[PDB]
Symmetry: none
Subunit: 34 residues, 9 copies
């Protein structure tokens, strides 16, 4: 048998998030000013 | 057998989120000013 | 047998979300000012 | 002054594609057989 | 003064692709058979 | 003065791709058979 | 006892997406 | 006892996405 | 007893994403 359970992944936050700047998950090329 | 359950993925937040800036998931090219 | 259940994916938030800026999921090219 | 040019993103191939299986960009859950 | 040019991201191949199995960019859960 | 050019990222191959198994960029959980 | 012009703007305000309050005593503002 | 022009802007304000309060005594401001 | 021009801007303010308060006594500000 194969049993897999209860995995997670959190990029920015969990249960409260604020953002006044730039959040990018993936960026091949560019400019970010924050 | 194969049993897979209870996986998640959270990019920005969960249960409360605020944003006053730029959130991009994927960006091949560009300019972000936040 | 194959059993897969209870997966989720949350980009911005869940159960309460605010936005005063720019939220882009995918952007091949451009400019964002937030 | 800002200049951002000539960026590319390639998932599977360019100039020739041949597929006799499964290709998925994003999957939240499920059984993929190939 | 900013100049950002000539960037690339390649997942599987370029100039020739051949697939007889499974290719997944992002998976949150599940059984992949190949 | 800033100049950033000629960067590349290659996951699986370039100029020839051949796959008879499983290729996953990101996985949060699950059974991969190959 | 003498309150006058608590918040004063002298030129354009481009956009308001938040609370501009002159005098706050009680209550709840969610902007 | 004489409160006057607590917050003063003399030219443009481009964007407001937050609390601009002249006098705060009590309450809750969530901007 | 005489309060005047606690916070003074003489040129442009480009963007506000936070609390600008003249006189704080009590309460809760979440900007």
């Amino acid at each position: 048998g194969y049993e897999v359970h209860h995995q997670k992944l959190v990029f920015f936050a969990e249960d409260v998030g604020s953002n006044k700047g730039a959040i990018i998950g993936l960026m091949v090329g560019g400019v970010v000013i924050a």
